[PDB]
């Protein structure tokens, strides 16, 4: 409602670097807010795409940003009569970024990995890897829970059980308030998908450069399954956390599986031990139900509510015809120990192929009325197809069915304006939470400052 | 007695006809002061109104083109007729309605294009062997239904990129079957093999030179191939006047839009053709799989009839996709494609077993209603689609157009066309709301308030600006 | 905390078999590799092999191929090392090791299991007094413990009274039996002025003999 | 297999010194080396992994360094707990191999030993054996040589030696030599001697007795 669409702020990266593919706010030890931006096709040293991360100080004018430097060199270790190998070419560093406390977690989901033992090998597969940084001190660390040293022949003998070679860990990322990093790995267990959790402090303390294969004892990975409903489900495409069981000491996980049960799509709510509490099934096949999940209390009862995006949902129209427009589902958490019922509200896009619901950002309380609000993105929507971000305000009965404000893309055609969103942080310190929007197609980020309600 | 034409008390010839389709206007000078000028045509002549000064438009419908339905789609140079009439003239007065008919025939011996788009992953190695004679076997069976048969062939596996594709050792790129004890082709997304031709022995010989590849994940990139086989008309060689059949065979799940993000691919499918001179899909490693919505739009645009010939283990999956892509047929393929021949013939019978009408460019103020005559002269009101037809059957529809008020544009035209058919009925509509005597009005007449008004059709109207 | 608690010391005969254990404490045995290392005073440390308890896949040094068999039961959180066709040269201390962070390291160690292979039966020692020959300011006595099996033996002077100025030497293997000796040093005005006794306890055969030293 | 040459075999140092153990491999191992510690009569404790990295809980006075095939463990300012055994281990290739070991020992001033000879007891002679015991107590350094002589002539068959660890009090070593003969062979001769060769005296310290005579 009260986002200023006139005086925007634009940050920009190098051409073709996909600057803005992912973003987040970052507060330093002094509470100063900055913006961390991933650019998963930033050129490395060998003039080859490796990705990169930028840490942008807040300026009303915007501009260029300094790089948050990471080691982009391929690594090799000859240990235990074996040869360990990491390959950082086309790894997509910055395909997801997330900040917690004074720590930045940037992930390269397509970093490849292989192990050689004489004439056998583990196969060069994308296990993924995340890089951690404390910008004020200069500390660095890595976390790659799917790296293994099992040779290819063994996987075939054991029939590919517990095969973590294609995890692509870091595809999606989130950090609990207690500091436990939760990584989505949609390719784990032969494209079933897995989740990896470990404390941030233990990642830093148990990491040494050049080891390549090391243990994090406090880590916890999800479990393989023989149920075909999970086959090629990409369980872990999107991840989020919240409180859904009434006990405030436990933290619950929300996992998107957009091709679960033969492309039906599903979202599951689990405890910290990966035991399933609820499962929201998709409505329409190939809609990619679970492409994006968001957690925030919208109706102001203190109980977190769940939002699910299905950006390929095809709406029914006249003459038995279907129009791919996208849809968002709202689930309000009931009072006490009860199951999440049918959706409380259906928000459906308008522009054909607009992919409404591709990104959902909790905004906090934008208009300061007492109810939290959200932003939904249609990266190819709007009358021109340049992209749209729609703001929906919270109310006592859930959300308003019509938007309160619509942000049209200030970038040319094909910028994917809205593909990545982040809100609920006051960056200019005026008392109102603000919204950053990524447009990786144009290699830019736009900052919308919230203003007093007109 | 007084009717709605009198009791409304109209002011002009134009407002008179707008009351009801039954009213008329009398533009005669010699007319009593107390007698109204806007009555039924019977009452006006009863009151000695000159028959030439009577404005009474009658809604009608006359045919302009009316070729006969052809008996054989064979021969001719797209001169086959399957819809009759092809063009009619329509004239409607305000708030009136008129009816007309249209005949549709599923013509016998109509040319056919069949493009065989085959999964060539490692599990299809046995299937390739059992269709070596298909081109001649199929030419024998379709010869009973048509005399213009053209067949082609394409092949797909998946996006040749990690992690779908093995990328180690270096040998595995040239031969993915390296760690086995055989040789197979390097990975390929989709390759066009044979342009649609009537020389069916070219099919057998191109098939005998084909071989399979091998990838890592069960879902295959078939939808990438369906898209390219559709939007690349000139390379596949679809004919203009022919039933286009796209046979899609696979024994596994398929990738859908947004799956490509697991390979670093985020650019949406642009629905354009990207098969160059090398006959390989060049955007396979840079462009995401197509979405069901985008496939539907292109299949409908090119009049392609997609056929899902899949094995039992994935029939339910593709039956559900078929529900989301109208006009699609499903058949149960055997584990070696040995039954693919009969599967194709039954699909062609099921495809042409339906006639469904569609309306394009209908003006906002026009509304239609349909009555269908399927089977033996059995009228079905409120329906616009017949089912259960055989090659050579003929159906007909009764249509009624109802106009609301009078639109600004006095001439519009819309189309009635069966789904997938080449011919169509063009309905040229003309809204007759004006009077012929308005073309001979007297602006600034001496008879009307010392020139302050205009004399038309025998009455005084206020001039412009008043 | 990480702690590896192994089985107690074993005492076996040649040609027989023994199965050692290594129980994980404060963690899951399935987490990392588990090695076994053999230690002897002369030959030093030797690496036997490893096992991944998650799947049961083992590696071995070709030297131990045949005698060593490594297994693991994730249920009891315990790893095992079985030795077969035991020999005199298999008498050693055996440790189980696991790494800290590095997948291939050797950081945390159990307390060790003492293995002794011998055909000797449970024999009681022979305690002999060692008085000097027929002068100075210091005098030194002795006590000889010969031909006992198995280890160990506790040795005190005057029942733990005279403690300072004593040297008890490590036992030595003399033809399948053990021999131990101890000396004590005092002043000339103490002996033979004060009675000095040699207390030897062999709890295996349950004998506590005492020999008082007498001059010549 | 990879041979681990660890040097020196032992060193005599004091509290507060800065010492350096070295380990040399038969080929490059690229920092794939670990360092171990075994306190007297106890188990092992890890010190270094991957060449330079401290194990959790180890004080910072330890440090590892080196590359290729030559590595070094250094202890800055020795503590009283640091006197123990130390081993290097490589895991660059299977099988894992260890170094010979290095023992840190307390340094002090030299001290000549207190020799003492003891004829066979009355009880042992009546049973059929005869053991002459020779005690060599409290000396430094540890390097010592014992020699048995029967009627002035050297004897090497039937000797049984035993040493103690460095004493906790005075930091000296001690040794026990035992010559065992039959009763019949013990009486064929008259003079029994054990000579002690230490660096504290160019002349061997001699102690002996004569059978029957006392
Ligand atoms: C292709 O598409 C078809 C239809 O779109 C799918 O078939 C349906 O699958 C769903 C899920 O498996 C089935 O839903 C279940 O319905 C049961 C009741 O069915 C009765 O009623 C229907 C008419 O509505 C009849 O046709 C049917 O024969 C029965 O008489 C419920 O009992 C089930 O509820 C239980 O299970 C769900 C999870 O499955 C739990 O969440 C619930 O809490 C509860 O425990 C369930 O709702 C549906 O019946 C199926 N229809 C048909 C016709 O088969 C295919 O699965 C799909 N295939 C692929 C490969 O995509
Ligand atoms: C389609 O069929 C319906 C019958 O269900 C027709 O409706 C009737 O048409 C007659 C025509 O004389 C009227 O007398 C009836 O009053 C109509 N009944 C209704 C409208 O309920 C309809 O006219 C037919 N239309 C066409 C275009 O054929
Ligand atoms: N998490 C689990 N429990 C789990 C889940 C799935 C799988 C799994 C493994 C291998 C599969 O097959 C791949 C290719 C396809 C085909 C030929 C081609 O198309 O190239 C061929 O032969 N191999 C399919 C599925 C294993 C384990
Ligand atoms: C229109 O309908 C009338 C009666 O329903 C019928 O007599 C007439 O033939 C119809 N017109 C056409 C063109 O079919
Ligand atoms: Ca909780
Ligand atoms: Ca709520
Ligand atoms: Ca609000
Ligand atoms: Ca603000
Ligand atoms: Ca087959
Ligand atoms: Ca595939
Ligand atoms: Cl047709
Ligand atoms: Mg296949």
């Amino acid at each position: 409602l009260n986002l200023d669409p006139v005086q925007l702020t634009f940050y920009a990266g190098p051409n073709g670097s996909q600057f803005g593919f992912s973003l987040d706010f970052h507060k330093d030890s002094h509470g100063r807010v900055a913006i961390v931006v991933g650019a998963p096709r930033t050129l490395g040293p060998s003039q080859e795409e490796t990705g990169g991360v930028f840490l942008c100080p807040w300026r009303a004018e915007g501009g260029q940003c300094p790089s948050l430097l990471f080691d982009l060199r391929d690594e090799t270790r000859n240990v235990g009569s074996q040869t360990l190998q990491t390959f950082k070419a086309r790894q997509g560093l910055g395909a997801s970024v997330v900040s917690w406390s004074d720590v930045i977690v940037a992930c390269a989901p397509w970093q490849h990995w292989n192990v050689l033992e004489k004439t056998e090998e583990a196969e060069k597969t994308p296990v993924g890897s995340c890089f951690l940084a404390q910008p004020e001190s200069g500390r660095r660390a890595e976390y790659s829970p799917c790296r293994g040293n099992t040779l290819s022949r063994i996987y075939v003998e054991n029939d590919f059980s517990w095969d973590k070679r294609y995890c692509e860990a870091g595809f999606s990322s989130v950090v609990t308030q207690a500091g436990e990093l939760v990584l989505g790995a949609p390719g784990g267990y032969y494209f079933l998908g897995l989740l990896a959790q470990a404390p941030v402090a233990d990642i830093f303390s148990s990491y040494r450069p050049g080891i390549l294969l090391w243990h994090v004892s406090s880590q916890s990975l999800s479990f393989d399954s023989s149920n075909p409903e999970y086959f090629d489900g990409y369980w872990g495409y999107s991840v989020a956390v919240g409180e859904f069981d009434g006990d405030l000491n436990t933290t619950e996980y929300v996992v998107g599986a957009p091709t679960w049960s033969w492309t039906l799509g599903a979202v599951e709510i689990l405890d910290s031990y990966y035991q399933r509490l609820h499962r929201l099934r998709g409505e329409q096949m190939a809609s990619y139900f679970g492409h994006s999940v968001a957690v925030t209390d919208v109706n102001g009862d203190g109980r977190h509510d769940l939002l699910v995006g299905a950006p390929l949902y095809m709406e029914s129209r006249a003459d038995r015809k279907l129009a791919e427009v996208g849809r968002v589902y709202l689930f309000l958490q009931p009072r006490g120990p009860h199951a999440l019922g049918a959706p409380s509200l259906l928000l459906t896009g308008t522009q054909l192929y607009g992919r409404f619901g591709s990104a959902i950002a909790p905004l906090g309380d934008l208009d300061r009325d007492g109810y939290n609000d959200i932003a939904v993105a249609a990266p190819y929507g709007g009358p021109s197809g340049r992209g749209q971000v729609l703001v929906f305000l919270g109310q006592s009965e859930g959300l308003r069915s019509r938007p309160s404000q619509v942000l049209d893309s200030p970038f040319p055609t094909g910028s994917a304006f809205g593909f990545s969103l982040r809100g609920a942080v006051d960056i200019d310190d005026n008392g109102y939470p603000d919204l950053i929007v990524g447009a990786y197609g144009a290699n830019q980020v736009a900052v919308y400052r919230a203003q007093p309600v007109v | 007695g007084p009717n709605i034409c009198t009791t409304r008390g109209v002011s002009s010839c134009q407002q008179c006809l707008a009351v009801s389709p039954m009213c008329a206007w009398c533009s005669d000078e010699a007319l009593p002061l107390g007698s109204p000028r806007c009555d039924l045509k019977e009452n006006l002549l009863k009151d000695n109104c000159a028959p030439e000064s009577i404005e009474f438009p009658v809604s009608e419908a006359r045919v302009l083109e009316d070729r006969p339905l052809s008996d054989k789609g064979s021969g001719d140079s797209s001169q086959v007729t399957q819809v009759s009439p092809q063009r009619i003239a329509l004239r409607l007065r305000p708030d009136d309605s008129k009816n007309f008919s249209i005949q549709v025939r599923q013509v016998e011996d109509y040319p056919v294009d069949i493009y065989y788009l085959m999964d060539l992953s490692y599990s299809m190695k046995d299937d390739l062997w059992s269709i070596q004679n298909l081109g001649t076997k199929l030419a024998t069976q379709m010869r009973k239904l048509t005399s213009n048969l053209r067949i082609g062939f394409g092949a797909f596996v998946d996006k040749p990129v990690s992690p779908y594709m093995y990328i180690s050792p270096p040998e595995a790129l040239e031969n993915p079957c390296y760690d086995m004890k055989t040789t197979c082709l390097p990975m390929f997304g989709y390759k066009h093999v044979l342009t649609l031709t009537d020389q069916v022995t070219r099919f057998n010989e191109e098939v005998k030179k084909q071989s399979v590849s091998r990838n890592r994940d069960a879902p295959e990139g078939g939808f990438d191939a369906i898209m390219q086989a559709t939007v690349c008309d000139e390379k596949i060689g679809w004919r203009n006047d022919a039933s286009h059949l796209l046979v899609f065979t696979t024994d596994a799940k398929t990738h859908i839009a947004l799956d490509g993000r697991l390979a670093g691919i985020v650019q949406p499918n642009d629905g354009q053709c990207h098969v160059g001179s090398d006959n390989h899909y060049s955007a396979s490693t840079t462009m995401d799989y197509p979405s069901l919505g985008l496939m539907t739009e292109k299949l409908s645009q090119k009049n392609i009839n997609l056929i899902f010939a899949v094995t039992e283990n994935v029939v339910n999956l593709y039956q559900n996709y078929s529900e989301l892509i109208p006009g699609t047929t499903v058949g149960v393929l055997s584990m070696d494609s040995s039954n693919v021949l009969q599967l194709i013939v039954d699909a062609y019978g099921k495809i042409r077993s339906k006639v469904e009408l569609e309306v394009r460019d209908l003006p906002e103020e026009l509304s239609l209603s349909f009555n269908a005559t399927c089977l033996n002269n059995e009228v079905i009101p409120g329906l616009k689609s017949c089912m259960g037809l055989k090659i050579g059957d003929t159906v007909s529809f009764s249509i009624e157009a109802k106009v609301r008020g009078c639109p600004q544009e006095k001439e519009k035209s819309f189309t009635i066309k069966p789904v997938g058919f080449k011919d169509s009925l063009i309905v040229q509509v003309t809204f007759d709301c004006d009077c012929a005597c308005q073309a001979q009005a007297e602006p600034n007449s001496h008879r009307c308030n010392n020139g302050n008004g205009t004399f038309e059709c025998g009455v005084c109207r206020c001039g412009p600006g008043w | 905390e990480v702690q590896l608690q192994q089985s107690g010391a074993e005492l076996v005969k040649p040609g027989a078999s023994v199965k050692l254990s290594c129980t994980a404490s404060g963690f899951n045995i399935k987490d990392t590799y588990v090695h076994w290392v053999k230690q002897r005073p002369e030959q030093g440390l030797e690496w036997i092999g490893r096992i991944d308890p998650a799947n049961g896949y083992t590696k071995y040094d070709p030297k131990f191929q045949g005698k060593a068999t490594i297994t693991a039961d994730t249920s009891s959180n315990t790893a095992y090392l079985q030795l077969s066709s035991l020999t005199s040269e298999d008498t050693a201390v055996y440790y189980c090791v696991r790494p800290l962070y590095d997948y291939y390291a050797m950081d945390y160690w159990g307390q060790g299991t003492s293995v002794t292979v011998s055909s000797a039966k449970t024999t009681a020692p022979s305690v002999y007094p060692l008085a000097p020959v027929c002068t100075g300011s210091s005098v030194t006595l002795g006590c000889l413990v010969k031909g006992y099996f198995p280890e160990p033996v506790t040795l005190t002077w005057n029942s733990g009274s005279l403690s300072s100025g004593v040297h008890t030497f490590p036992a030595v293997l003399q033809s399948d039996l053990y021999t131990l000796s101890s000396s004590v040093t005092v002043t000339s005005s103490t002996w033979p002025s004060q009675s000095i006794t040699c207390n030897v306890a062999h709890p295996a055969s349950s004998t506590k003999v005492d020999k008082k030293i007498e001059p010549r | 297999d990879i041979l681990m040459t660890q040097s020196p075999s032992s060193m005599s140092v004091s509290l507060g010194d800065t010492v350096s153990i070295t380990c040399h491999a038969s080929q490059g191992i690229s920092s794939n080396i670990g360092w171990l510690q075994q306190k007297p009569g106890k188990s092992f404790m890890g010190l270094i992994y991957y060449g330079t990295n401290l194990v959790d809980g180890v004080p910072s006075r330890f440090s590892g360094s080196g590359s290729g095939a030559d590595y070094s463990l250094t202890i800055s300012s020795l503590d009283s707990e640091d006197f123990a055994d130390y081993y290097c281990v490589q895991y660059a290739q299977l099988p894992y191999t260890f170094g010979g070991g290095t023992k840190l020992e307390i340094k002090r001033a030299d001290a000549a030993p207190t020799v003492s000879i003891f004829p066979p007891s009355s009880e042992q002679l009546t049973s059929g054996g005869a053991s002459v015991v020779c005690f060599l107590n409290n000396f430094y350094p540890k390097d010592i040589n014992v020699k048995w002589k029967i009627d002035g002539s050297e004897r090497q068959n039937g000797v049984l030696n035993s040493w103690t660890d460095q004493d906790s009090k005075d930091s000296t070593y001690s040794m026990s030599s035992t010559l065992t003969l039959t009763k019949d062979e013990y009486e064929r001769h008259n003079s029994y001697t054990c000579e002690a060769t230490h660096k504290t005296s160019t002349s061997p310290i001699v102690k002996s007795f004569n059978r029957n005579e006392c």
Side-chain angles (χ1 to χ4, degrees), chain B residues 119-124 157 215 217-220 250-252:
Chain B
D119 186 339
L120 280 198
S121 57
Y122 198 87
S123 60
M124 305 291 284
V157 182
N215 78 113
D217 69 331
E220 316 289 18
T250 186
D251 61 0

Side-chain angles (χ1 to χ4, degrees), chain A residues 255-320:
Chain A
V255 179
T259 54
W260 181 83
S261 178
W262 295 270
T263 66
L264 176 61
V267 173
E268 294 181 346
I269 300 177
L270 328 156
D271 59 358
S272 54
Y273 300 107
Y274 309 116
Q275 306 306 315
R276 183 162 40 85
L277 311 180
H278 202 71
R279 177 194 289 156
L280 294 317
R281 306 172 69 96
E283 186 185 16
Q284 181 183 92
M285 290 173 51
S287 64
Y288 244 66
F289 180 90
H291 174 277
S292 50
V293 295
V295 176
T296 184
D297 178 29
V298 304
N299 59 343
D301 57 0
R303 298 186 295 267
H304 276 154
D305 305 304
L306 176 56
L307 293 134
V308 178
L312 296 186
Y313 178 85
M314 301 190 296
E315 183 186 42
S316 295
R317 289 184 174 178
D319 199 47
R320 295 282 189 98

